[PDB]
Amino acid sequence: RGSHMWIGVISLFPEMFKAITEFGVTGRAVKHNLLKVECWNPRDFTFDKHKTVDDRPYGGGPGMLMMVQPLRDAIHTAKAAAGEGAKVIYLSPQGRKLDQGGVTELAQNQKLILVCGRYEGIDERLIQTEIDEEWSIGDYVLTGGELPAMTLIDAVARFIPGVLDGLLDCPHYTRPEVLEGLTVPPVLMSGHHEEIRKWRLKQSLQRTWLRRPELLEGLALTDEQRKLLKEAQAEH
Amino acid sequence: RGSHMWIGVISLFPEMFKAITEFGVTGRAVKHNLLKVECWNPRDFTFDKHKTVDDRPYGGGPGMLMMVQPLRDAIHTAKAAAGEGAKVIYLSPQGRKLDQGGVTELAQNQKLILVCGRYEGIDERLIQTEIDEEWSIGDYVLTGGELPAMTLIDAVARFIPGVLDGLLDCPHYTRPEVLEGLTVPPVLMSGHHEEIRKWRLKQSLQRTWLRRPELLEGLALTDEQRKLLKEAQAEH
Ligand SMILES: CC(C)(C)c1cccc(C(=O)NCC2(NC(=O)c3cccc4nocc34)CCCC2)c1
Numbered sequence A, B: 001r002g003s004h005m006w007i008g009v010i011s012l013f014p015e016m017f018k019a020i021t022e023f024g025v026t027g028r029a030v031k032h033n034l035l036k037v038e039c040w041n042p043r044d045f046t047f048d049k050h051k052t053v054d055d056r057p058y059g060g061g062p063g064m065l066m067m068v069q070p071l072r073d074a075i076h077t078a079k080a081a082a083g084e085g086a087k088v089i090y091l092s093p094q095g096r097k098l099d100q101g102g103v104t105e106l107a108q109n110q111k112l113i114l115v116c117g118r119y120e121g122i123d124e125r126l127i128q129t130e131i132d133e134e135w136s137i138g139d140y141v142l143t144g145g146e147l148p149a150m151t152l153i154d155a156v157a158r159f160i161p162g163v164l165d166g167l168l169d170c171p172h173y174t175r176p177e178v179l180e181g182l183t184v185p186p187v188l189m190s191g192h193h194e195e196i197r198k199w200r201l202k203q204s205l206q207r208t209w210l211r212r213p214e215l216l217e218g219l220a221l222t223d224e225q226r227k228l229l230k231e232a233q234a235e236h
């Protein structure tokens, strides 16, 4: 149309992204030219014999950093290929927390460049001069930002035209009817779609309430949803 | 010793895990027999001609589910290979939030089995009969649980003996001294390691304070850390 999404990746390990470009939903999205994922490797932007990509930190210590020159130059080549208006994102443990709202924001960009850290990360000044936003997938210690980048790609790809609420899912049941002695809720077997709808929405709201209450803090629930939630809170 | 960690994976797309078994820190950990990652594919546990792995939900609707039989039987084969005492984890959007504390808990298990969902997920009753715990990497909509599983593997692998605080990092600086006109904080160039230590710890605490305050809510800071934080709060 062209609504195809383009995502550039800066990574020391571009072959990892096969995990999203060759498999599943994203893989089908790449096969049908709805998503293009392009990788540039800082290892290819070095000029010494040994293709060095780490550097010592000013101040000393054991924590190596990504070498500034090969990293910056990969970013620039990626910006040159994106053309005007690509948003550059540092997958960073000190970034803004990723959540579904954040995903919808990022999905509104047609060109993104993802920068994946290694070692203890990248020079602070590279954030000022090259990074537009910093995003984190959660508060845990990883060894690189590739997996966070792929998670991020997977989440945004669902907003690409041609690829196909905010609360937790209701329980799902498939065959068989009785599984190790455990039976499906009769309402789902009943065949009355209006009782099934009310139950599924009510169970969704109770799950959200019990297991992730904070997802409710930003919604104004519908009349029906407030009624079904109040019932479920009392029945508990 | 044997302290080698073993992680079984149940996935419709086992080839994705090459992204952690063939690259980086985890790849070195697999090459040196410190971590073993074994995959079983529900597609291999089917008995129809077309190797069907999805099923319709009781209650109707467009949301397909993982078919119970091939999934359950892959889990069982994985449990049989683990031997006594493997913890089975469903990577699930309705699970307990992953955070560094959670990672250290999970890293205390020598055998883990990771179950990765596809479609809208797995039968509720399979959680009662086969899943020990449910874990989520964050509040966003993905298309499968493989990437969450790999993130989880990456985080726990750092606790394997032979592979090598809780606050956000201080800013890092490497060469060059002046980068697009931006200079390194003089203290890092100074060569006095005691001033460098105090600065790095103080900047770490301010970052944590400003960008992720909630990481402070579970610590009793040291005398030095409380002093450096109070200073930084006033200087802001
Ligand atoms: C937050 C807290 C747990 C206190 C903490 C403190 C200090 C360091 C780290 C840490 O994990 N540093 C290592 C690196 N991690 C990530 O890149 C990374 C990690 C997590 C989510 C992410 N989302 O995008 C990129 C992410 C950074 C550069 C190389 C890997 C984490």
Ligand SMILES: CC(C)(C)c1cccc(C(=O)NCC2(NC(=O)c3cccc4nocc34)CCCC2)c1
Pocket: A100, A165, A166, A167, A168, A169, A215, B091, B092, B093, B094, B117, B118, B119, B120, B121, B122, B135, B136, B137, B138, B139, B140, B141, B142, B143, B144, B145, B148, B149
């Ligand atoms: C929480 C909220 C955003 C409201 C929401 C509501 C409803 C569905 C989904 C959703 O993403 N469902 C799809 C699946 N997602 C994940 O498996 C998954 C997603 C995120 C983190 C994870 N950590 O481990 C596995 C994870 C589940 C089965 C196939 C993929 C998310």
